[PDB]
Symmetry: C6
Subunit: 252 residues, 6 copies
Amino acid sequence: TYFYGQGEIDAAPIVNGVLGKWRWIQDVSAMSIQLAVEKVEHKESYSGQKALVRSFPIGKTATVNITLHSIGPDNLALTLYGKVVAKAAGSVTGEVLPADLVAGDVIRLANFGVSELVITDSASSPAPLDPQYYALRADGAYGEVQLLGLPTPAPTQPFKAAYEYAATKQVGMFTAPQPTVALRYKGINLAEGGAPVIVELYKVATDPLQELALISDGNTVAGMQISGGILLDTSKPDTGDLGRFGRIIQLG
Amino acid sequence: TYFYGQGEIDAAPIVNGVLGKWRWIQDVSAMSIQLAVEKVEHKESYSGQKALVRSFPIGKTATVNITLHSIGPDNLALTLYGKVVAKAAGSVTGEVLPADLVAGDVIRLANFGVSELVITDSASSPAPLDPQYYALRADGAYGEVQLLGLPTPAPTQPFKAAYEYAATKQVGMFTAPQPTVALRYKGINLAEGGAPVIVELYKVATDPLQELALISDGNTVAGMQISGGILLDTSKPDTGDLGRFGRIIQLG
Amino acid sequence: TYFYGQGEIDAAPIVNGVLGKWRWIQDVSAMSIQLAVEKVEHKESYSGQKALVRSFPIGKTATVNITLHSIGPDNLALTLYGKVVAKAAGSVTGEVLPADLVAGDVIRLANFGVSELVITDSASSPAPLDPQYYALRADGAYGEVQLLGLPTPAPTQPFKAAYEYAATKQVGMFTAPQPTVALRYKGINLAEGGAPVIVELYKVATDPLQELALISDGNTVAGMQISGGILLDTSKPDTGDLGRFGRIIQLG
Amino acid sequence: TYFYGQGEIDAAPIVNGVLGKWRWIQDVSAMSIQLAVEKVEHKESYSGQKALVRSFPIGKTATVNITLHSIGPDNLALTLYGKVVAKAAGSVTGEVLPADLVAGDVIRLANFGVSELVITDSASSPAPLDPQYYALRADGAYGEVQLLGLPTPAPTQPFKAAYEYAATKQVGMFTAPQPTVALRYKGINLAEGGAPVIVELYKVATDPLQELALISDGNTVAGMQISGGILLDTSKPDTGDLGRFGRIIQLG
Amino acid sequence: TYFYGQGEIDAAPIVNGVLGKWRWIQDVSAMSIQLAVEKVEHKESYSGQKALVRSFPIGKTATVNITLHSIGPDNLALTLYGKVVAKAAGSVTGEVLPADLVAGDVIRLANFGVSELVITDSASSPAPLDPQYYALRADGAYGEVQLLGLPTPAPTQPFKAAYEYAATKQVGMFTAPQPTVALRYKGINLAEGGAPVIVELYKVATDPLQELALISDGNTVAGMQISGGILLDTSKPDTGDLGRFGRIIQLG
Amino acid sequence: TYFYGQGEIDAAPIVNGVLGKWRWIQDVSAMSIQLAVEKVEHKESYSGQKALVRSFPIGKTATVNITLHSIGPDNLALTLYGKVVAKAAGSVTGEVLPADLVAGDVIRLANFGVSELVITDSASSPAPLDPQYYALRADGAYGEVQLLGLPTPAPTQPFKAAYEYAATKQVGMFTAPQPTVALRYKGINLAEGGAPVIVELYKVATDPLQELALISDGNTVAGMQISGGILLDTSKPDTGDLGRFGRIIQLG
C-alpha cells in the first residue's frame, strides 16, 4: 500500500485516429501527472454566516510531465515536431572548393564523416596535391579541412575535392504536426516486493521541449522535459468504468 | 495542554445525504485545517484619527489538506473521481496476434499476468510453436512477448495465442462525481501521556490530487495530497452547541 | 534600557461592553504588535525640486499576532468561534448495533470512553455474548468494537449494546460570534535584572486560527497563530494621556 | 577615504517651528539614508536609434531608517505617537474587592508594585485577615493576589483592601501628533583612525514602529525599527551651500 | 582572450558642454554596463506556423552601475547632487550659551574641533570659570560640553564662550543640478599577463545614491552604489566608427 | 543515447541574404535552446465535464542563449552592434599640452602605448625638459604623464609633446545594425565515447549583451551572455525534411 515506482514507458503515435506501433521511449527519469478541476460554488444566507454550502465541478483537465534523457532521433522527432531523414553513405567526385584560398583558411565540406580525401589540382594534367599540405580537424567528423601550406609555384587556385561520406540521420525543427501519442507506463513498485503497476493514457498531446543545453556543466546528464495535455477520447464507451482519460491497473 | 498528535482517519462517503460505511483511509502523513473569514469594517471620524472602530464577519469557510501515502484502489476511487472495476481471472483461446511478425518484434497482450502461454500455428494441422523461439519480458506481468527466432521453413504468419490471465482492479480517470465524505480523525496526543482526541467533520467536498510522480527519485515515499472544503451541513440543529462545520472532543 | 521579555497574557472577554472575568491563556510562544498609519502629503514647487514638504496622517490602525501552544477547550472556544459543551458521564442500555454484521466488521459507538461493554443477544431468553468474540480497539477510547468471531449456531443478528461512557468537553466550529477580548501582557525584562513591564490593550477583535496541523512531523510542538485588530475604545476619556488603543507601564 | 562608522544620534523635537531640547536616543544599531529622484526623459529620433538623449529631474525625496534597541519611555513617546504620564507613589485605603470570592480566585489590583497589603474584613468590628490565607504572585509586581483559603466560619464576603503603590511611567497609544525631529548623527570612522564625522538632518517626519515582539525567541535583543521622510525646510537660505535637506561635515 | 579586469576610473564633469578637469574617483569595487534594446517584430503566415520572420530595433539604451567605497567630499558632491563648502579655521569670542543651565546639561556649540575653551562669567568683573567644573565630551570633536558642577555662590547664569574651531568641508543635500560626467575606465586584464584595456563613455547622467548605512554591522566596508544612463552625444561624427555612446580600446 | 556535449561554435554573418565567412566564436561556456508554441483549444460539452478535447498550434518560436567568455574585438563587434576600427602605429610631433601646469597635474594624451616621450620647451631656442621632472604612470599604457617638478626659473608654460603610439583596435557602441548570423555547433558527446553531433541554425537575430562587469570579484572569469531569436528562413524548400528553423545531425 506504498508506492516507489521504477519502470518503462511505451508510446504509440496516433495518426487520424488509427493506433500506431508502440515504441520504447528509452530512459526516463521523472513522470508526473497533475489534475485540475474548476468548481462553481453556491452559498446559503439563512444562518447569517454567508458561507459555502455547495459546489459542483465544471472543468476537468489533466497534464503530464516527462523528463527523458535520450537524444535518439526517434525521440527527437517526437519532441521537436520533426521527422527523421536518413542519408545513405556515398561519394563525392567534383565538389569545388572556395577560390582565393591561402594558408590558414578552413574549408567546410557539405557532408560529414569524410575519408580518403583527395584534392585534384585544376590543370590540363591533373596533379593531386600532397597530403602533407592539408590537415583534417576533428578527424574529419565535422568536415573541416585546414591548409598547412602551398608549393612555391602556386598551383591553380580553384580545387576539385572528392571523398567518401558516411550515412547520417537528421531531424528538422518544427517540420511535423502536433503529435498525439497514447502512453503506457509499466512500473514496478519496490515498496511491495516489486509489485506490477500499469498506467494507461489513451490520448496525449505533447508540448515541445522547453530547454536543451548543448554544452553542459557539472556531472548531470542532459535532460529533456516535455509537457502534455491528456485529451478526452471520444471512442471509448461513455458508461464504461474505464473512463475516457486514463486508467490504472494493479494486480491483487 | 500541549499537542503532538498521531492517529487514524476514517472516511464515510455521502450519497444523496445518506451516511455511507466508514472505512480507514490507510496511512496518512499530514493533516491541516485552515479557517477563512471575511469582515466588513466601520470607521469613526470624531477623534480625527480616521481609524477602525468596529468589524463584523460576513464570510466563513474552512479548508482541509490531507497527505496520504496509500495507493490502494479504494483510495484511488476517492482521489481520482474514479470507480473501482474488478476483473476476475480467466482464459483466452483464440486471440489473434499481429501479422507480418519478424524477429525482434514485441507483442502486447490485452490482459496482464499471462501464464501457460501457447501460440498455435495457423494450418490445417495445428502445430504449437517451440517455446524456445519466444520469451516473456517482465515475467509476463506487463503482457509482453518477444520473438527470439523463427524456423527456416517460415510458418504461417498469423498466430492464435491462448493463455491464462489473473484478476485485477482498475480505476478510471474522472469517471465518478465529486465525492462528499464525512471525516473522523481519532488521534493520540503524546504530550499528555497519549491522551485521546477526536475531530469530527460532517461534510467535506474533496479536490482531485494535484501531482502524482510515477517515477520517484530519492528516499521519499510517494505522497498524494488532497484539498477539500468543509461544507455547511443543513441537517444538524442550528442552535446546538455542536455547530454545523465540525467539532472536537477531548476527554477530561 | 534593553528588552528581552518573557511573561504571561491574561484575556477578558467583552460582552455588550461589560468587562468579563480575566483568564490565563496558558503558554504563549510569540507576541507581536504592528502599527499602520496612512499619510496625505503636500509638495511645494517654488524651489524647482517638486519635493515633499509636508505630511499629515489620516489613518491609524494596530494589529496583534499571538502564537499559543495550548489546545485547551477554553482557548478553543476563543480561537474557533466556538462555545464549550460539557457532557457528563453516563450509561447506555438499549443501543442497537447495525444489522448484517459478520466477522471483521467494525462498530462505531455514539460515546467515547466505553467500559464494561455488554452486548445482549436478541431472543426471548437474553444471552449475553462471550467477551472473547469481540475486541475493543484503542482501549475503547474511540468507541470502536471489532468482531473476532461468531458461534457456529449464528445468533440473532440485531444486537443490544449497553455500557458506560465518561464525561467530555466539545467545541463547535463557528458556533459563537466574533469575540472581543481585552488583553493584559505581564512580562519580565531579563535585560534589566528581570524588571516588570505591563502592556494593556483595551479592545481587540480576533481572527480565527489560520492553520492547525492535526498530525505533526518533527520535534516542534503544534502552534496556534491568531491575528487581531486593536479597535478604538470610545469609553475612555479622549483627553487622557492613557489614549484609547493601548498603554505600557514600566516601573522606574 | 573609507567608512565604517560608529556613533551617537541626538534628536530635537520641532514644535510649531521652534527648536526643542536635544536628547540622546540611546543605543542605535543601524542607520540608513536613501535618496529617490524622478526624471523626465527626452529622446531624439534623427539617428534612427530612437534612444535617450536628455533627462531632467522633477522629484526629490529622502528617507531614513533607524533601528533602536532602547525601550525607554522617552523613546516610546517618540515612536508610538505617545506622551509620557508620570504617576507618583501613593496609598490606597478603601478599595473594594470583587464579591463572591472563593479559594482559587485571582484578584487584580488597580496599581502595581503593591506592598504592605492589608485586607480588612467587613464587619462592625474590623478584623484584618490572616496573611497566611492569601499570596502575592509575581512578588506583587503585577498586582495579583491569590486566595489560599478561608476560615471555616466564612467571613463577610466583600473586602476592603489597603496597600502602597510605587510610582510609574506610562505611554499611550496614538495619543500624540506626528512628531517632527531634527537629527544629528555624531560618528567615528574607524577606517581613518577614528576620524570625526557629523551628519545633520534639519527636518524629519517619523513613521510609527512597524513590529514589536513582546515575547522574543533566540539570543537577539528586541529591535525597534522606525522609518521617516526628510522634509524640505523652508527657513534656511535657498542659495546657501548647506542646502535644505541635510549636510555632512568631515574635518580635514 | 579572457577578461578579469582591475583598474581605475577617471571622471570629468560636463558643464554646458565644455569638458571639465578629469579626477580620480578613488577606490571602486564594481562596475557593470547593461544594454537594452526594443524590437518590433514581423510574422509571416504563409507556412501555417504563424511564427516570427523578421525583427528591427527601435529603442537603444545603456545603463552603468558603479560601487565606490570612498566618502570623500569630492565624491559626495558628485553622488549627493551637492557642492563642497570649505570653512577656514577661526575663533569665537562672544558666543552666548543657553540660560538656566544646571549640572548635567549638555551644551552644543556651533563649530567643531573646539580647543582652548574659555567661558567668562557675566559680571562687572570678568571671572573665567574653573576648568574643573566642565568637561569636553568626544575630545571636543562634536562640540559638546558637559557641566560637572557649579560653585555654591551660583554665578551669573548667562555665559560667554570663546574658543578656536578648525577648518571643515561640508556637502549639502540636493544643492546641485544633475551632474553629467564623461568616464574613462583604465583597466588591467590579468588573464592576459596584465594587458591594458580602456573604456570610454562620453556622456553619462548619474542617479543619486540609493542607500547609505551610517552605522555598519559586520566586516564589510560601507559601499556607495550609483546608477546612471549613458546619453547620446550629438557632437561626435555620426558616420565615425567610434559611435556616440562609448568605445573600447584593446592594444594588440 | 545519453548527452553530455562539449564542442565549438562557428558563426557566419548574413548580409543582404548572402552567406558570410565562418569564424570561430572562441571559448563558449553554455548554450541553450528553448522552444515556445501557442495553442488554441477546443472543448466539448456533451459529457458534462466541460473538459479539453482538442488543441492546434498557432505560434512557433525558438530562442537561443549563449555564454561566451572571449572579449576579442571580433566578438565585441557581434555582441555590441559595433564595427572594428584599426589604428596603425605612428608618431606625434607638435601636440600641445594644457597650459597653467604645476607640480602634481596629470596630463592625458590622445593615444595609448606612448614611448620615447619628449616635451620640448616653448622658446626661441628649443630646450627639451629633463626626463627626471616627469613620470609615466602605468608605463604609458594609459597615456598619463605626471609632473614631478619644475626648474626654479619657471620655463614657458605651454609645451610641445612628441612621442610614438602603437596600433590599436576599437569597437563603437551601437555603431552597427542588428547582425544576423547562421550558427553551426560542432560537439562531442562524451556519454557515447565521444560521438560527433552537429547542430545547424540557419538564421539567428542576436540581442545585445545584458551585463558586462568591468571590475570582477571572485575567481569567476567574466562572462558575456547573448540572447537571440531563430528566425524563419524563406529560402529553404518548404517540403524538405530539413525544415526552416534548424536541424541536428547524428552519425549512426
